[PDB]
Structure 1
Amino acid sequence: AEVSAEEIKKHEEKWNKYYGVNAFNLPKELFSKVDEKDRQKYPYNTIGNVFVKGQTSATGVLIGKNTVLTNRHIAKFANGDPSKVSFRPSINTDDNGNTETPYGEYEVKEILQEPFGAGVDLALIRLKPDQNGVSLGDKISPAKIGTSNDLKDGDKLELIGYPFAHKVNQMHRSEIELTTLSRGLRYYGFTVPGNSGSGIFNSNGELVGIHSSKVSHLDREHQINYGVGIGNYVKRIINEKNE
């Protein structure tokens, strides 16, 4: 299917809203740092930084009492070794050398590297409770798990995660706009690779997908964001495996 030059031009112009200026110069409506008070509330408080030994850190979402959803491509670098992964919910490192971890840093008990299949870029990370026996989901309500079934082309959603290449250990939100949904979640929006595993939320605060990567779009020379929606299969597996 040859896409028309007109459609390519429309795509380039829309994509350029997010990438045509420096990320620091983006309008706050499209991309902004989550401030200290906002990190305290839902859904931002479900978002954490996934550290994997030898890799730059990425994002994950607390979805159960001890369970974090992230990308398979992020979890795979642990080589199945839970000692190589840690989860830092609402970590914030300011620009002046101070890190806060209001809920502590969580060790990992088990990695489910590909419970949705190798071609579905999602992984489950099961956390140990803290040293006093307190699970992360005891301190914070996990994200409400929604569905991708009601999403439509043009829908605006909120993507929340840790855009490492832009700022290290600083939660940011990005407004995304869904496009062509026939092949899964694709969307306009500002992301960087640390956003892998970011939560995508609707206005009701329901998790409807997880950011994955960028993929070619329309032709081989253009691209779009891709995420994994909480579709019928993904929701079924989450409900089987969550804890």
Structure 2
Amino acid sequence: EVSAEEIKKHEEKWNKYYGVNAFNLPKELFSKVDEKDRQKYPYNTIGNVFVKGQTSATGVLIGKNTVLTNRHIAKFANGDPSKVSFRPSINTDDNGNTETPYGEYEVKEILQEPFGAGVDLALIRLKPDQNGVSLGDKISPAKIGTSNDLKDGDKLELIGYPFDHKVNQMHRSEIELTTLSRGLRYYGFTVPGNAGSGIFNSNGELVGIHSSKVSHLDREHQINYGVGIGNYVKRIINEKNE
């Protein structure tokens, strides 16, 4: 039971992201990443995880051949790697011109729930290109930070592919952390395609991965939910990354 004032104020914040049209959102909270920034770190570590005829979400390159995304996204492939494709820094302008600066990568192995069925993270291992060159040799993987030092009120950058808004167009969303006692929760604009988006701190370190929206305060309100890179997650990553 939370005071009726909290709900009133929550609806306040939440509304500044979902009350107005996505296109009429302030640049500071939600904006497309231009060609220039897309070639720079950490933006170039972001890619589109494409599951043929299932979904189109986001993923972060965290190793030479490893992509970190959500378990719920990886489940759509039903264990079959050939159903998943990773397209780093892909971009499709409003006129249909699609470009993939680093090519498209095939998946050799899917680790659906290496952190546990209750942690919405999965690892995707990619095959090198036909010349045997790993994506991680073309682009430096994201630096892995920690979520242990974050605190209520903190502002972070969420980078991903908001498919439902614009197809194959990388966007950044400013997020504001809230009640962290119940997990990584935050205010910000996201759509289903943002699943797997990287959350970076001012130091450019990856501190979390966006997951989805969950009930908040009561059973009738929402908030964004992500998975923080805590002690347990880092251990597993360091153990299976490659």
TM-score (norm 1): 0.99
Is contact 1:63–1:242 with CA below 8 Å preserved after alignment?
Answer: yes
Is contact 2:46–2:89 with CA below 8 Å preserved after alignment?
Answer: yes
Alignment RMSD: 0.4
3-state DSSP of counterpart to 1:174 = strand
Structure 1, unaligned runs of 5 or more: none
Structure 1 residue 189 displacement after superposition: 0.2
- CA distance in 2 between counterparts of 1:185 and 1:101 reads 32
Corresponding position of 1:141: 140
- CA distance in 2 between counterparts of 1:231 and 1:55 reads 30
Structure 1 residue 183 displacement after superposition: 1.5
Size of the alignment, in residue pairs?
A: 242
Is contact 1:63–1:145 with CA below 8 Å preserved after alignment?
Answer: yes
Structure 2, unaligned runs of 5 or more: none
Aligned-pair identity (%): 99
- CA distance in 1 between counterparts of 2:133 and 2:23 reads 38
Is contact 2:55–2:73 with CA below 8 Å preserved after alignment?
Answer: no
- CA distance in 2 between counterparts of 1:148 and 1:100 reads 34
Is contact 2:198–2:206 with CA below 8 Å preserved after alignment?
Answer: yes
Is contact 2:70–2:211 with CA below 8 Å preserved after alignment?
Answer: yes
Structure 1 residue 56 displacement after superposition: 2.4
Is contact 1:152–1:181 with CA below 8 Å preserved after alignment?
Answer: yes
Is contact 2:144–2:205 with CA below 8 Å preserved after alignment?
Answer: yes
Deviation string 1:13-37 (CA, Å, 9 cap, x unpaired) is 0001100100000000000000000
Deviation string 1:115-144 (CA, Å, 9 cap, x unpaired) is 000000000000000011110000000000
Deviation string 1:67-97 (CA, Å, 9 cap, x unpaired) is 0000000000111110000000000000001
- CA distance in 2 between counterparts of 1:226 and 1:109 reads 29
Is contact 1:56–1:164 with CA below 8 Å preserved after alignment?
Answer: no
Moved over 2 A (4+): none
- CA distance in 1 between counterparts of 2:196 and 2:134 reads 21
3-state DSSP of counterpart to 2:180 = coil
- CA distance in 2 between counterparts of 1:54 and 1:79 reads 13
Is contact 2:55–2:76 with CA below 8 Å preserved after alignment?
Answer: no
- CA distance in 2 between counterparts of 1:142 and 1:96 reads 30
- CA distance in 1 between counterparts of 2:204 and 2:240 reads 22
More off after superposition, 134-143 vs 50-59: 50-59
TM-score (norm 2): 0.99
Structure 1 residue 213 displacement after superposition: 0.4
**1:52 is the counterpart of 2:51:** yes
Is contact 1:177–1:189 with CA below 8 Å preserved after alignment?
Answer: yes
3-state DSSP of counterpart to 2:203 = coil
Corresponding position of 2:236: 237
